[PDB]
Design a protein around this ligand. Structure first.
Ligand SMILES: C=CC(=C)CCCC(C)C
Lengths: 362, 362, 362, 361, 364
């Protein structure tokens, strides 16, 4: 057990075989569920006290809820005795995700009154994937009508666009936001026997043209269809997130680029015991930009089964954040980034996006 | 009298036989009633200055008023010369309980504009019990119409549900919130000769299935009917509160579990002179979560007639809170939790929920 | 003479015979009248800058204006050359008293949109007495219509109630608030030759039943007609205020209780040179509760002609408040209570409520 | 002297030299130079300059008026600055009409129209400013408004049993009336009318219960409903009133000026400095509103008393720590409200009589 | 040659960017500040979000100038590096969208001047908007804003034709030469795109501003003109002059060439043995960068426009080092920006190709 760590990499990777979460993951689920009013998964209502207490910026709440939801789906697969709890939490995740506090930036920015009708794939990609994971975990048809409606909007918008995929803000295309939307089509197809996922091949061909640097195994920050502009910086957090989700749909795609991604961005230090991730090229600084390169690489390492890099990144991320378990509930005194407990939770439990797609019924 | 204690456990337990409150309980009633504008029981108006001055969070004000009300009902039973004052204070408790500042979280959370119509048993359970205790103490029919209306809503909601009882927020079931609602039906029946309390047996059978760990004498945190999920943590404050109220309706039920509850949660320390209560299993930490395990166990100890545990808990709770009596009014310099003066007041005077049910008329 | 005092007790009691206020009272009138915009008696407008600068709580502004008004009425009787100024200041006192900033707490508490129509005798008792004193001082009929309307409301409400008098907040009866309303009926009768004051005898009989402890010469805090409750604490500030005003209507009543009041509450200390007043029984602490026991006893001492107690209380109250006269205007650096300059001003000039009733015309 | 920017001789010579002192030019730079935040940047209802100096809302109307009276003297001092002074007066009038400036009248509950009746504090200044604008520029931009407000003031004087007009209802101030009467003299100069004929009855009225003739000092205020005169004399009230009256009846101010100085003015530091007591029965300087010394500085200028001017400016300016940065004047520690406004005005003031006789452009 | 201390690149490097068809690494790091981080970078989205400006504490009234100066810099980036032209175009698209948000123009309404910021006057706002419409279309060839561009160009032309003085006021009765210079340049850009002759109005404007608005001996414009009163504020302004001469150089090079040497004599202080320069804002002071505090920053732009490498080097040696630039994760930040519009004006001066060269920008 390296210093400041709560459990071994071996323990996190063995959770599924043992059909039990580690005590520190159970303590994270207690933070998420235990205390009246202030725990994030206390109620379906439009209360965001848990996010106010952690100082989550408004624009990031949608990602907070989504990453918690993706983690809860893996908890359901790990421990059958926690599947009902995971289902309950996903029900709350979907309700909170639909509150105006979460999507309202779309209206305040002047882009429209309806966050699903067009564009805004950042928000509605996550919502659509969450509808699907909720139904895979619980077998409940509570959101089926909404799920079918949003899936058809995403399919129709892909069919209408001359580029493969959907924009976020108008004229802003991000590969990582698209990767969530495409994965949501795979989940819908698993539930209903449809073929919405057939659009995936053209998308994977499109993002391998001007959106990737194939030598570095790295995606450019964004694409802008009106001007044809690709922003000339590569992004580690963008790439780590995209390759993790793509691995669930086309494993060979992520396997091809993963080693080049690591060469481009990953700095091993402290005699092989630790790693930290550079956000872009032409710098020695770790975790610049949004500051999430290391945390998303931790998720990618888990998705790809790379125990060594997982261990190195968690040795960098967790100890300085000063975890403590008080009354069987996990707190970090010094979270090192946005989405800190969310992304460490997700990476600790993640079963692979492929395994979530094949989740047995309840 | 140990240092920082204001009176002996023997003195608190003798109050009913002597037909007099201890001087420190009288000084608590002075805090509650004495100073113009800022005392909590100054006026019927929707002024919450007393709660603003002690920094009571909005969501907790409803519990503050309720616990004061339950204490005042016991004062009425202890000293006939204080019964009119207790009645006046209960009148104010009911008026304040109906102010939007108290119930308004129900609307802000997006659950509805009417706090009584459906669900919300946390709020309307306390309100219904308060209507009843007011009428037991005073004989006044001021709230009788409202009391009948809310009692019929609670009866109809119980009859309609496939599980025994009523949810708080939608799909959130709490045993402690239900225990208040069921006790309110016993009080209505005492006033009117009805049999709304007949629903209690099915409820006591239901909460002894998946909602209790019978070996540990401990209720799980909550139940979620849509998913069938029971949150997998046991809760001391939940159990202490529920067993205290159930003792008034089915004494044998609470007698069965009380010894197991104490084994599971109660830590005796300082050579038997003190006790503190763990909030959940798998921790040594006292008073985690909402931080009320010890304070609600103090009430349960009083309800069960356990003088030794009462003395031990009050020796833990009161001295560090630094009580002082200035101008015959009680203040705590360092309240150790939410609802601190409310729950110590209640535990000091509590005559048993059974004895409140049999309160002689005015 | 004594250290930190501005003038001798002999000087304050001689003001009427010399037909001149002391220099320190003139300096108080300068604080009240001198500086543009920020002096309290600058204009009729709904500007409360003077009260914002002293941090007067909203609920206390009505008492601030009233006590200033009662002092100004005595200034009119002391110095005929200041009677026109006193009249001008009383005109402003009445205008400001009618501003929503002053009465608005009645609406915000949820008791109604009209502060005069019913109850609220705290506010409308003072207003009615102020209408009367304004007309006694000036001979002006400016407010005569309003005065007749409010006097008739007070008379009708007394006639309708089964207890003698009127409540403040609904179901809250205070003897001190009633004493102001009854005195306002004596002033109306002195202006118009009516007999509204005939209701006084039944009131004086009523407050000598459960509302007084006749052995201790002390009124209980309050009465609550719905429940029949009398709060079981005696109050010095309540008693001092009530006996001062009653002395103007039934001198024998206040003469009977005054010596017992002093025995119950007044602590003489520092070898007979100083006095301070306990607010309630069963304490050694001075000036608890609202903190006005000593200041209202100073007024009562003046009303009863007790120079020794006046001198003792002013030796306690004034020196620690650190009076300073700058540019012929009085300021206190450390006022010891609410209504500090108001009540010291009033006690220094007070000619007796009886003498204000027989105030000869201009 | 140390902390002074220029000699008393220099300020009093400005008109003869047809040039403002460099420090007065630096004050005009503070007033005019920086985009958005200078007080005379635009006609708009922007009050950034006043927010930055923490001017209380109720004082902004006096700030604008005193700047305007100074700008009228700048126009008389330097013909090359007359167009600038005219532009600044145009802005002064526009800003004076913004609700931020007059709005206290409505918020206090006295009415929605600040001109219709009473409120002579506000509308006296506005009327004098309309007149000075037209004397400086020859522009008829505000002529209609000027005629309307002049007729309101004349009609209200004619209707009142006391000589003049109240501020807040039942509050009569001699200093506020003195501005209104002077505005009638300016209207008469522009149009050949005789609105100023009302002045004699006013000067007779204020010499009854409103003045202590032995001390040369006005009482604080008069209250017609009650007949009350507040029993304190006021230096700032007297200094302001005598300065403005000197422009209409020089003999009146000449009669009282020496008694005023005996009553209120303390010479100290071996004759080099002076400070002014606000009322009688105190040794404290600059109590009450804290403007006794600043208004006495203006009165000293109006009466041609160079010695007292020098003494007061030696008291007022050095502790305020003037600095000129990039040819613009700032005070680090202004000692009162209206500080840069009243020092500006006193430094340039040509006399209210000379403003009345301003030659056309 | 040598890199002076605290500077990021040599004057020679900035002036060679066009010939090398590449921006310096520090200009690329400025474009990364402008474009890189989600939500908080100024050119993240078309939306009415101003987080980037809230984080730098930009006063509301200055946001319109911030966007405009970024836009003028981006136009030169498009001319420097063809591989960045599409990015420059995308950023200009966002600049135009943000420029139309009420947060940017709203001061016009709050000041009480009207509910429509374009209909009349307000030439400081609508001059920049009109020039930005034109630069967007020169860079991208996109007709997205063409209708709006034609509408605003005709408003500006009609208002010039209607006024007895040459040009348009900002606030009513406030005339500024620098604000007019932007509007006139916007007519030259429209003419380049459409073959029209709206720019013919320029000659009468250049004749007008050489009467009472300039001190021809000192090569310096007066602060402002006020048509109602005929008043010219009697102070000369360096930032006013530097800005006006830079833009006029694109329309009448001989005009700016005539006054530039006199401007430098009047305002520019060379110090530290010829290595540094700082600019006095007005006459009759030794203090540098008084008033709005932008004399030196606008003189840096003018030096670039006039091809004066020596003065450019001296001013940048004064401005940049004390601001403490650092490049973190390939993005430029200043720890102590010395003025308003600091990163905007240094960015612009570093890339500026000349307003004449932007007018002749080849198509994509
Ligand atoms: C009613 C208005 C006045 C008394 C004007 C004088 C006020 C000042 C200069 C603070």
């Amino acid at each position: 057990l390296p210093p400041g760590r709560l459990a071994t990499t071996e323990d996190y990777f063995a959770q599924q075989a043992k059909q039990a979460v580690t005590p520190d993951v159970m303590a994270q689920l207690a933070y998420m569920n235990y205390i009246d009013f202030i725990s994030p998964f206390y109620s379906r209502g439009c209360s965001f006290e848990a996010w106010e207490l952690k100082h989550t910026p408004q624009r990031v709440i949608k990602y907070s809820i989504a990453f918690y939801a993706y983690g809860l789906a893996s908890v359901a697969l790990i421990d059958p005795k926690l599947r009902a709890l995971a289902g309950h939490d996903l029900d709350i995740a979907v309700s909170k995700m639909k509150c105006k506090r979460v999507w309202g930036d779309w209206e305040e920015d002047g882009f429209g009154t309806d966050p699903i009708e067009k564009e805004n794939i950042m928000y509605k990609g996550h919502l659509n994937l969450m509808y699907g994971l909720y139904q895979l975990v619980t077998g409940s048809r509570r959101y089926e009508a909404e799920h079918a409606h949003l899936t058809r909007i995403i399919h129709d918008e892909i069919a209408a666009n001359p580029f493969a995929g959907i924009v976020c803000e108008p004229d802003n295309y991000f590969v990582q936001c698209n990767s969530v939307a495409y994965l949501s089509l795979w989940v819908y197809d698993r539930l209903h026997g449809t073929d919405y996922r057939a659009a995936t091949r053209a998308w994977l061909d499109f993002i391998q043209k001007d959106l990737i640097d194939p030598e570095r195994g790295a995606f450019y920050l964004s694409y802008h269809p009106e001007s044809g502009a690709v922003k000339p910086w590569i992004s580690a957090y963008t790439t780590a997130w995209t390759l993790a989700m793509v691995h669930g749909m086309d494993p060979a795609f992520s396997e091809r680029y993963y080693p080049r991604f690591k060469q481009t961005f990953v700095e091993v230090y402290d005699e092989g015991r630790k790693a930290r991730v550079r956000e872009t090229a032409g710098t020695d600084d770790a975790d610049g930009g949004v500051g999430l390169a290391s945390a998303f690489t931790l998720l990618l390492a888990r998705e790809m089964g790379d125990q060594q890099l997982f261990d190195q990144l968690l040795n960098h991320l967790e100890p300085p954040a000063k975890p403590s378990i008080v009354s069987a509930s996990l707190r970090y005194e010094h979270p090192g980034s946005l989405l800190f407990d969310e992304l460490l939770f997700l990476a600790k439990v993640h079963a692979g996006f492929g395994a979530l797609l094949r989740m047995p019924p309840p």
